[PDB]
């Protein structure tokens, strides 16, 4: 005769640029894309903070700049482009200034627990990045299909 068979599959753990736990976090609205496009799991620099109006003009991280926060994942604000989710010019952003988020990584080795995070020129985590941050790792280290992700603990500037 025949022997019946059963299969089992486990879902992934996380997707790029999404929150990790329900710990204390502080997301910031009232942020505008001054120029260009911002990926969901990437660092963000502040070009200028308005005095009277109060909006903060943000931009993608570049060389010789201090990171401020990381964009997060939302199904309403984000625009569908480049086979992913991005924030377009002249639109609001949800930037996380504190908490734990799943970032994008160009690294190939698992990190430690309480070491400082280093970012490269385009705002993605790298083992030997030139840009130094005050954030620390959190322990999470997984990947989604062909995309590598890492968990990072952010602190307020």
Q: Which residues bind its own copies (CB under 8 A)?
A: 13, 23-24, 26, 28, 46, 48-52, 54, 56, 66, 98, 110, 113-114, 136, 138-142, 153, 155-157
DSSP class of residue 115 equals: P
Tokens 């309403």: give the residue. Answer: 76
C-alpha to C-alpha distance for 80 and 86, rounded to whole angstroms? 6
Closest CA to 95 of 34, 35, 30: 30
Residue 69 CB, nearest distance to its own copies (Å)?
A: 12
Tokens 């609205």: give the residue. Answer: 29
Residue 103 CB, nearest distance to its own copies (Å)?
A: 15
Q: Considering beta carbons, is residue 40 or 46 the nearer one to its own copies? A: 46
Tokens 């990926």: give the residue. Answer: 39
Residue 84 CB, nearest distance to its own copies (Å)?
A: 24
DSSP per residue, 62-112:
-TT----EEE---TTTSEEETTEEEE-TTSB--EEEEEEEEEEB---S---
Residue 140 CB, nearest distance to its own copies (Å)?
A: 6
Q: Considering beta carbons, is residue 47 or 79 the nearer one to its own copies? A: 47
Q: Considering beta carbons, is residue 84 or 127 the nearer one to its own copies? A: 127
Q: Considering beta carbons, is residue 80 or 156 the nearer one to its own copies? A: 156
């Amino acid at each position: 005769a025949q022997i019946n068979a059963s299969y089992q599959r486990d879902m992934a753990i996380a997707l790029p640029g999404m929150v990790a736990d329900t710990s204390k976090y502080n997301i910031d609205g009232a942020c505008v894309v001054n120029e260009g496009d911002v990926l969901v799991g990437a660092a963000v620099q502040v070009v200028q903070a308005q005095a009277v109006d109060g909006h903060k003009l943000v931009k993608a991280l570049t060389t010789g700049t201090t990171p401020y926060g990381v964009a997060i994942r939302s199904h309403w604000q984000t625009v569908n482009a480049q086979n992913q989710m991005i924030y377009e010019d002249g639109g609001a952003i949800n930037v996380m200034t504190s908490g734990r988020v799943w970032m994008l990584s160009k690294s190939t080795e698992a990190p430690t627990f309480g070491s400082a995070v280093k970012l490269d020129v385009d705002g993605q985590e790298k083992s030997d990045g030139t840009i130094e941050t005050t954030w620390t790792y959190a322990g999470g280290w997984t990947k989604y299909k062909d995309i590598q992700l890492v968990e990072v603990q952010l602190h307020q500037l």
